[PDB]
Each structure stands twice: as C-alpha cells, then as structure tokens.
C-alpha cells in the first residue's frame, strides 16, 4: 500500500508527459529494456510517440478509471481508460493497462507497444488517410454568393522561357504592361530564393478575361476562396488564411492544408463553413495488414451560411461612401433584418486571400482611416439624432408638451454662471418661440438641453434604461454593449444636457442605432436586429409610448419636407421619407482642429419597409451623409415595403 500509491503517481506523471508533448519526460519512466520489461530503449520511445502522435496530431491525452495492483515483489500492474484528440475528432473509451517495476526506490513502467494504442504489438505500424472538407459558402438574403469557392485565373512566369538579356527584358516589360503589374515587381519575383529557372513563379490573380499573353507568360486554373462584392463587403464578411503549425496545435481538427478565416464572418462561422475532414486512422501488422481501425468516418462538407444582407444594398450602400471614413446599416425595422453592413474605407479581401505583398499589406495599415476598422460595429456619440429619444422619453413622463412654445433667444444659453463659458449652441436664431416640431426640423440644442435639465436625470434614465443601452446583442459580430455614460451617475449638469441632443459620453454603433430607432417603426416596439436569415424575430415591447410615435415621427416628416428643414435635400427624391440628421463634434486633447461626424436616419413611415443609418467620420468640408444617401433610399424604398 505504500508503494502502491507511488505506482499511481508514476502513471498520472507519465500520462501528463504524454498530455502536454513532452514524449523525451515520458520515455525516461521506463524501465530497462528487456524482455517482459520495456520493449524499447528510452531515445526509440521518443521516436515512436513522436511519429505516431504527430501523424495523426494527437492533443491532450487526459485518463479515467485508474486502478494499480500488485502481483509479485517488484512487478506491480496498472490499468486506465483514456481519451484523445486526433486529426479526425476525439478518440474515446481506450483500454490500456501494463505493468510497472519497483527496483531500487524509485517505479517505473515497463513500456510496450500498447501504450500507444491499446491494441498495438511489436512491430505494427500506424496509417492516417483523409481527405479535405469543401469549404462552405456564404449567401444573401436571395442566394447570390458572398463568399464562395471556385476556380480562379493564375497569372505567372517561367524564367526559362523569356530570354537571355534584351529579349527577357522586353518581354517583362511586355507582360508588366499587359497584366498592370510593376517591372520591379516581376523581376522581384523570378529573384526569391524559392524560384528554379523551369519553374512557373506565380504574379497575380487575373479578375477578367485572359488578355494576350507574351512570351513565358502562363495561365493556369486553381480552386480559392472568391468574394464577388470585393471590398464593398470585406469588413463583414472577413477572408480566409493558410492554416499555419500554430493553428494545428489549438484545433487538430483543421486541416493542415486548408483555409481559416481570420476576420470577420469567415472567422465567427469557421466551425460551420469549413466542415469536418474525413479518413480512417488504422493499426496495421509488420506485414500492411489492417489490424485494427481506430477511427474512420467520411468527409462532411461545409454548411453555407445565408445571410439577411441585400448584396444589392451592400454595393450601393458601400459606393455611396465614395471611398470616405463613414459606415451605413440598412434593415427591415420590422423583422430586423440587416440589408446592408457597410463600413469604407475598405481593403481588397480577394487580394488578401490570394496572398497579399508586405507594402501592399502595411498600406492598409498605415492608412490612416484605418480600412480594417469594422465601422458598423464602433461606437460613436450619436449626434442629435439622439433627439428622438430624448423627445420620446420627455413625452411619455409628461414634461414635453408638443405644442408648448419655448422662449429661446440668440444662438447660446446656459443654465446659470455655474456653467463658466460653457454654452449649449444652436444654428439659427430666426426662431425665438420653439416647439417639439421647430426644434426637431432645425435641430436646436438648446430646446433639447432645456427639456433634458427640465425632466432631470431620474426621469431621463428611467426612459432611457428601457432600450438596449448595455445588453449584448445577439449577433456574430464583435461588438461592444452600448452606454448611456462612464458612470450610473452623470454627476453634472452640463453633461445630462450634453447627452440630451446626442454628445456627452454616448457610445452607440451604428447597429446599436438601428435597433433603438426601431421604436419609430413598430410603435415603440424595439425589433433586435437581425443577420442570419432562418432566426426568429425577437422584439421589445414598451420601450417608448404609442402616444410619443405618433407625435414624433410626423414631425420627422417635416424634417424633410419643410423648405428648412435639415434634410430637404432628400425631398427631390418625392417618397415618404422620415428622417432626422445630426453632425456631432469631436476634439480629444490629441488633434488641434476638431473632428465632425455626420449622421442620417431614415425610413419610410408609410409602410415601414426600410430603415437605415448612415454615417461619415471624420467628414470632409461640405460633405454629409445625406449628400449621399438618394441611391441607397431610391432602392430601399422600391424593394422593401
Ligand atoms: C446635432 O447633431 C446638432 N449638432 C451640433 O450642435 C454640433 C454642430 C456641428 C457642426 C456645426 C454646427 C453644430 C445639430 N444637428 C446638426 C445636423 O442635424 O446636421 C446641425 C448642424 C443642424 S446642429
């Protein structure tokens, strides 16, 4: 009994040798090798668990059910159930048992095939086969392809067949200026140390058709990852990568010569789209007979992923960024379907996947409107479009009366001297008595900073907790929950009026934003957005009053209808519109100038078909979101009712 419980602790430590890839810790708790002893000597043991368990990728050997005897003086057995992790899922309910040794002080086991695998003897030998899982597809609302596998056109070059000199350079020179690529690039190329003189050094990924080709200019088909929309959708659907040793070592499950998304959809689906890789792992005898099959199961390709977004709207959402920092979300208020995820600027996930030049890459870092930077999922302070709220709120607890009349004079004001030279700021001061209607068509601050001191900081989160400010959304897209503030107190009254017309400490996504907004289409019902397109609708009910949307949104209607109102740009397009625009300031003690983010929400408030939010950050002079939003509206509105 005393020594059985050092043969116990010296199959936990080999086990944990094994667990953890340390095969050299392992074969060195082995006794002598003899026979009825250890079968092999402790640097062949080495060998054997390595070939072996890195054949078939072998993780995380953990056992159960251990129990150690005793049947002679020095010859102690032992037997355990195992499991493991392989290149073809998990391998379970595996029977070992041996025997140990008890010379000198110390135990020690002696080592048989069977340690490996349970049924191994002598000399047998293991086989992995498998195949690769097809990777699966991810598809629009209406079936058209988002990211798909297919066969691509691979530009390249022999060195052999171009010439000796003059006649080398000129036909560089020729296939630099038939396929757009840079002379100091081709001759980059056909240099790395990789490159034999017969080989076919790849260039680029041919988009179109095959021009003529010169001299030892080649073309040859190969399967890869395809994204029809290209970098008008890259943010959110992400690209895929080549598995690296890395991977390999955190999931055995991947396929050593497949693709992993590395961003986006891509990445947050990867279990589903890419499938589970078939073959059978099997013992067989020194002669190649299969002994034993340890696991076998056949290849299941990957499950496509259909989406709710529009690949229509996506384009035309994304265009009408016209390259600038900015991101628009368009849904279906009702169901909460997201037509379009858009974020610009934007990187070229068709090059990224068919690998991608060290300049090239860094571009897209170094830019310094970040394309990587997943707009539609960043929090920004929402800009007076925030207006809408603090109304909806504001007549539901009473204080706002639609058609009492403020006396607001000049373009500043501040609730008393306590304030220093802090003043909330209006941009016309042709109006002095304001209402609910004037102060949402010309946006005024100072009628919104006055109701928001007015209603007091209780009220004011007692309407606002009822919306989604904090919750995690239920999507496959990381993102954080939005906030109200730093704190639960605003601890000021200037920052209470603050967050009443927008600024403040808001932090909203656009998603986020769509989701609060969805109030003015369903009644002050709250519908959670929604991208995979079999989910169930899922809704919040009473976040804002009937009473406050029927007051609200014929307003909105006026923002784009009235000759001043913000958005009666939007009035050419001639169908009925709701909107209401905001610009919000930014200026961190890091940038001299401030920064300006324009803002624009709209929908139909006829049939509540559509709804969308658009944004620019970091806006250009004489630039807005509603300069741009025509194209996106004249297709919602046609397509979605
Ligand atoms: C809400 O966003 C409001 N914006 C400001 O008070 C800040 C600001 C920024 C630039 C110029 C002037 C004032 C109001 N809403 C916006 C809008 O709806 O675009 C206005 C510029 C009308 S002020």
Known sequence: TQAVEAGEKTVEQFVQALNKGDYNKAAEMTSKKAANKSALSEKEILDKYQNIYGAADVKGLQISNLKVDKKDDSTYSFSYKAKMNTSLGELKDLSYKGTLDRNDGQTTINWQPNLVFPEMEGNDKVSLTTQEAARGNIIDRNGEPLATTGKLKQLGVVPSKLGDGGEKTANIKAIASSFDLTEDAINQAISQSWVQPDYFVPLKIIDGATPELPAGATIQEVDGRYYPLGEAAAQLIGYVGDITAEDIDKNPELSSNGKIGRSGLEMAFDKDLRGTTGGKLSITDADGVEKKVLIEHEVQNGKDIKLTIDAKAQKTAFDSLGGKAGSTVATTPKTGDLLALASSPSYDPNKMTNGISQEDYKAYEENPEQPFISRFATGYAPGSTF???????????????????????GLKWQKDSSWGSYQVTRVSSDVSQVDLKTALIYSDNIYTAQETLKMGEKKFRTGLDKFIFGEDLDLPISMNPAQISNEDSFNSDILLADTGYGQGELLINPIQQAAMY???????????????????????????????????????????????????????????????????????????????????????????GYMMVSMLENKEDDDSATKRASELLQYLNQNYQ
């Open 387 to 409: 207006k809408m709220i603090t109304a909806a709120i504001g007549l539901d607890n009473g204080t706002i009366d639609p058609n009492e009349v403020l006396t607001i004079n």
């Open 518 to 608: 969805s109030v003015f289409a369903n009644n002050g019902t709250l519908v959670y957005p929604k991208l995979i397109a079999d989910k169930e609708t899922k809704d919040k009910k009473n976040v804002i009053g009937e009473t406050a949307v029927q007051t609200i949104v014929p307003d909105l209607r006026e923002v784009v209808q009235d000759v001043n109102g913000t958005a009666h740009s939007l009035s050419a397009l001639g169908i009925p519109l709701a909107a209401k625009t905001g610009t919000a300031e930014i200026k961190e003690k890091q940038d001299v100038k401030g920064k300006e983010n324009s803002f624009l929400f709209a929908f139909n408030p006829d049939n509540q």
